[PDB]
Amino acid sequence: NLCPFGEVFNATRFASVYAWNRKRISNCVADYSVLYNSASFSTFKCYGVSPTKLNDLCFTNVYADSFVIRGDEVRQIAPGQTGKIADYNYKLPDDFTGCVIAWNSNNLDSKVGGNYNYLYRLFRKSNLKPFERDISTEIYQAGSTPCNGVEGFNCYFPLQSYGFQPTNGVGYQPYRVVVLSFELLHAPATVCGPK
Amino acid sequence: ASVNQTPRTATKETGESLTINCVVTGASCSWSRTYWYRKNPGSSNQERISISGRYVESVNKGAKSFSLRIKDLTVADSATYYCKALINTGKDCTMNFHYDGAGTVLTVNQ
Ligand SMILES: *[C@@H]1O[C@H](CO)[C@@H](O)[C@H](O)[C@H]1NC(C)=O
Ligand SMILES: [Cl-]
């Protein structure tokens, strides 16, 4: 009966942003007041909905995307943004209907000597469409000469590690991010609030 | 669930070669190779291994395995080598996370 939002926010592991995860939420009641009444988030921004009114709303489906980025990239998780993350890793649509939530996760995701287990995509032939995901590992041809799957000058591996160090300032620290999409289609609603 | 990497340790003389195998274990879902990397003694840095020349790799989806081969071993190749994979998980194989092998400690002599 109760939507499994705990599993999303509380999960011990989070995805790399380039390999971001999505959880479908359906056929359940969701008490969103638990989120918005929580002071543990550094970012909590909604588009097209007022969070306080969620507990009295119904949607066809809810989607929860989650991943880690650095603090000064959270700005890119908004409609109409550009940057390595927005262009090449995770893109919201211009008409996004949902909420972006984030918090500093230095005390989980930083490691002494550096945590290299979080990755992002540095290059791509074209920008991602909204909610597109790209997990490929092809050598990126940055010049005119074909790479033939070999690295070298202007032939670049496309993923790069963040390398999160606890001694880094907060703009460079890891942030966990949860994007809630609220989908409304001409179909029976399956995700409603306590009212 | 995991990646089983063999051998766990290895000692070789200059000129020989090393083969490392990584078997994706406890997975009913698909997976993909991400990259291989090394950690040099006394450093926390992870140096991704670019596949070319004396570094040959292969992938065998039938055996749920991927491998790396290093030719013309030199003393400076002494390090611990890791394989990283991106594995789908969960009931419907709808989530993914990266998993590393437990590593191959290579010592090169002569
Ligand atoms: C995470 O787990 C704790 C367990 O005590 C719970 O109180 C909390 O509400 C959970 N978080 C969310 C967002 O549900
Ligand atoms: Cl091989």
Numbering used by the authors:
A (entry chain A): 334 to 528
B (entry chain C): 20 to 129
Task: Tell me, in the authors' exact words, what the paper reports.
VNARs are the smallest (~11 kDa) naturally occurring independent heavy chain-only binding domains in the vertebrate kingdom. The receptor-binding domain (RBD) on the S1 subunit is responsible for engaging angiotensin-converting enzyme 2 (ACE2)—the cognate receptor required for membrane fusion. Here, we detail the identification of a series of VNARs from a VNAR phage display library screened against the SARS-CoV-2 receptor binding domain (RBD). Crystallographic analysis of two VNARs found that they recognized separate epitopes on the RBD and had distinctly different mechanisms of virus neutralization unique to VNARs.
Among the 12 interacting residues in SARS-CoV-2, only 5 interactions are conserved in SARS-CoV-1. Among the 7 residues that are part of this key hydrophobic interaction, four were conserved, two were replaced by residues with similar properties, and only one (L452) is lost (see arrow annotations). For example, Ala348 has been replaced by Pro335, which is a non-polar like residue when cyclic, and the aromatic residue Phe490 has been replaced by Trp476. Fortunately, most residues that changed are still able to form similar h-bonds. The final major difference between the SARS-CoV-2 structure and the SARS-CoV-1 model is a result of the deletion of a residue equivalent to Glu484. Lastly, Ser63 forms a backbone h-bond with the carbonyl of RBD Gly446.
